[PDB]
Design a protein around this ligand. Structure first.
Ligand SMILES: CC(C)(C)NC(=O)N[C@H](C(=O)N1C[C@H]2[C@@H]([C@H]1C(=O)N[C@@H](C[C@@H]1CCNC1=O)C(=O)c1nc3ccccc3s1)C2(C)C)C(C)(C)C
Ligand SMILES: CC(C)(C)NC(=O)N[C@H](C(=O)N1C[C@H]2[C@@H]([C@H]1C(=O)N[C@@H](C[C@@H]1CCNC1=O)C(=O)c1nc3ccccc3s1)C2(C)C)C(C)(C)C
Lengths: 301, 302
C-alpha cells in the first residue's frame, strides 16, 4: 500500500536525448531513427525572439550551422525542415537505442512523465497533468526547452509533449511532437495569458478512491446524489462537470471498493461545501486532481 | 521556475534489475558485476516467514534452487552467501550494463529515488525521504521486495535502500545494500512498531526558501529569533531541533535570497503557532519536509 506521485521509468527516453546548438543558442533534442526533433526557436538569437519570422531565419541557415552532440559523439546534419513549431534535423546516424514509439496528442486531464534535461543531459523525472487551460505546472529552468513528456504502455513509448516556454504565472507551455501547441500560445515573446484553470473532477474522484483503498475513509457518508445535482454544485466551485463517460471510467474503482460513483460524488460535494477542517487525505490538505483513474489502478492494483 | 517532487532518471538502475525465484517465492534482485543482491526472505515459504532460522533454511538450499532471470536470459548461479539480511548470488555472467556505483548508508532526513519493480521489471519511480523513525512513506505492492533506492552524483549511482516489508501503519522498512536494516526492524512476521515520527525541520526551511525563490513570500516577516528560542517552540510541535550545522547547510539558500536563516526561522515559528489560514505555499496547504537543502538548490539553481 501507500500512494505516491509516481513517474514512468525513464531509461528508454534517456538514450534519445541529444544537445542541439545553432550559433550561441543551445537546447535539447529528441533523437529517433535518423531524425532529431527540437523546438524551432533554436535558430533564433535573443534579438529574434521578440518577433521572429521563422521561415526567413531558416532559409538563412545551412546544415553545418547545426551542431548535434549525443554525449561526446557529434552527429552530422544532412537535412533540415520545419514542421509547425518543431525543427526536424536529418542526421547521418540512426539512433541504435531508438525504442518502439509513437507520437500522441493528449487531452486535458491526462497525465504524463516529464524528463527534464539540460545540455542534452537528463536531470530529473516527475509526473504532471495537462491542465484544462492547456498549461502544465512543471519545473523548468533556462535551457530546458526540448525536454519531453511521455507515457509507457506495454513496451511502447508514447511521446506527447515537448517543452518550449514559461508563462508569467510560473506555468509551462509546449507542443506535441508534430509541433502544434497545446493551447492558444505561440513561440514568440509577445503578451499572452493562459485562460482560467479548473479542477479536474474525475481525477479528484479517482484520488478519493485511492484514499479508501489505502484506509482513509473519514470523508465518506451515507448519502447519494445525481449527476445533475452534483454538476450544479461543482460549477459553483470551478470544477469540471462530470459526464457519464467519467462515471464509466471509474467503474473498476467503484467495483474494488464497493462504493458507487454517485455515493463518492455525495462525499465530494460535502467536502466542497464544508472543507476538510484541518483533516488530511493521503497526506494532503487539499483535493488532488493530477491522478487519473488509470494512474490509481496502476498504483493500487 | 516551478517546484516538483523530482526523482533521478532511472535508466542506469533499470538495467540492473532481475527476477529471483526460489521455489514458489519470487522477488526482485540487483545485478552488479557478477553478483545478484536480493532480500534473504526469498528462501522462505509462506510457512517459514513467521519464525525463520535463515541459517537453517540456507544450508538446505543449493545453487540450482535459485532461478535468476534477466529479461529473456537465464543467469546461472554458481555460489551463494548471506550478508546480514541480504542474499548474495554469484552468477556466471557479469552485468554488461553495470554502472559506476557505490553502496551508501543514508541518515534520516536524506532523500532518494525509489525504482519500484515487480517480477524484475521496473514499474515506476518516485522520491521519498528516510523518516526520523527510519521508515519510508513509500508505495509498494506484493512482489516489490528487492526494489532499490538510489541517488545519482555525476556519473555514479549511490545505492542506499533495498525494500523488504510493510508495517501495519502502511509505511515501509528495508536495509542498506550491506543487509543492515534501517531502524529496529527484523525480517520476520512478528509484532513490531515504528517509533513516533517527527517533522524534518531543516527540510521545511529549505522548502520555505524554495517558495521565496518561486515568488511565494506572504509568510515572511521582519522579526528574528534565536536558535534556542526557535528550538523551544519546535519541540512543542514535534519538530526536530535545529543545530548550527543545519544553519550552515542552508547558507547558499540564505545567500541567494538575502533572507538570513534565523529570519526564516521566525517565519516558520509563526506558521506553527497560527497555521496557514487557508493559504498555500508552493501549492501545498501543509508544511512539506521531504526536500533537502540540496534538492532545492539542484531544482532551483542547476
Ligand atoms: C511569451 C510570454 C511573455 C508568455 N513568455 C515568455 O516570454 N517567457 C520566456 C520564454 O520562456 N521564452 C522566450 C523565448 C523562448 C522561451 C525560452 O526562453 N525557453 C526556455 C525555457 C524557459 C526558461 C524558464 N523556464 C522555461 O520554461 C529555454 O529553454 C531557452 N531559452 C533560450 C534563450 C536563448 C537561446 C536559447 C534558449 S533555450 C521563446 C521563443 C518563447 C522567458 C521565461 C525567458 C521570459
Ligand atoms: C512484521 C510486521 C507485522 C510489522 N509486518 C508484516 O508482517 N508485513 C508483511 C510483510 O511485508 N512481509 C511478510 C514477510 C516479508 C514481507 C513481505 O511480504 N514483503 C512484500 C512487500 C510488501 C507487500 C505489501 N507492501 C510491501 O512492502 C514482498 O514483496 C514479498 N512478499 C512475499 C511473500 C512470499 C514470498 C516472497 C515474497 S516477496 C517478511 C519476511 C517480513 C505483510 C505486509 C505481507 C503483512
Amino acid at each position: 500500500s501507500g500512494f505516491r506521485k509516481m513517474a514512468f521509468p525513464s531509461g528508454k527516453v534517456e538514450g534519445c536525448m541529444v544537445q542541439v546548438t545553432c550559433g550561441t543558442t543551445t537546447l535539447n533534442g529528441l533523437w529517433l531513427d535518423d531524425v532529431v526533433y527540437c523546438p524551432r526557436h533554436v535558430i533564433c538569437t535573443s534579438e529574434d525572439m521578440l518577433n521572429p519570422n521563422y521561415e526567413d531565419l531558416l532559409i538563412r541557415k545551412s546544415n553545418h550551422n547545426f551542431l548535434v552532440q549525443a554525449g561526446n559523439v557529434q552527429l552530422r546534419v544532412i537535412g533540415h525542415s520545419m514542421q509547425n513549431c518543431v525543427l526536424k534535423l536529418k542526421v547521418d546516424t540512426a539512433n541504435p537505442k531508438t525504442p518502439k514509439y509513437k507520437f500522441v496528442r493528449i487531452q486535458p486531464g491526462q497525465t504524463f512523465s516529464v524528463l527534464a534535461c539540460y545540455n542534452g543531459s537528463p536531470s530529473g523525472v516527475y509526473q504532471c497533468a495537462m491542465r484544462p487551460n492547456f498549461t502544465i505546472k512543471g519545473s523548468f529552468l533556462n535551457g530546458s526547452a526540448g525536454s519531453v513528456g511521455f507515457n509507457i504502455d506495454y513496451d511502447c513509448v508514447s511521446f506527447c509533449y515537448m517543452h518550449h516556454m514559461e508563462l508569467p504565472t510560473g506555468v509551462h507551455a509546449g507542443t506535441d511532437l508534430e509541433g502544434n501547441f497545446y493551447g492558444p500560445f505561440v513561440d514568440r515573446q509577445t503578451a499572452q495569458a493562459a485562460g482560467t484553470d479548473t479542477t479536474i473532477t474525475v481525477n479528484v474522484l479517482a484520488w478519493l478512491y485511492a484514499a479508501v483503498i489505502n484506509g482513509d475513509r473519514w470523508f465518506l457518508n451515507r448519502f447519494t446524489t445525481t449527476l445533475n445535482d452534483f454538476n450544479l454544485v461543482a460549477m459553483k466551485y470551478n470544477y469540471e462537470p462530470l459526464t457519464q463517460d467519467h462515471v464509466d471510467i471509474l467503474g473498476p474503482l467503484s467495483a474494488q471498493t464497493g462504493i458507487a460513483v454517485l455515493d463518492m460524488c455525495a462525499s465530494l460535494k460535502e467536502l466542497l461545501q464544508n472543507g476538510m477542517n484541518g483533516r488530511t487525505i493521503l497526506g494532503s490538505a487539499l483535493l488532488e486532481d493530477e491522478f487519473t483513474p488509470f494512474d490509481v489502478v496502476r498504483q493500487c492494483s
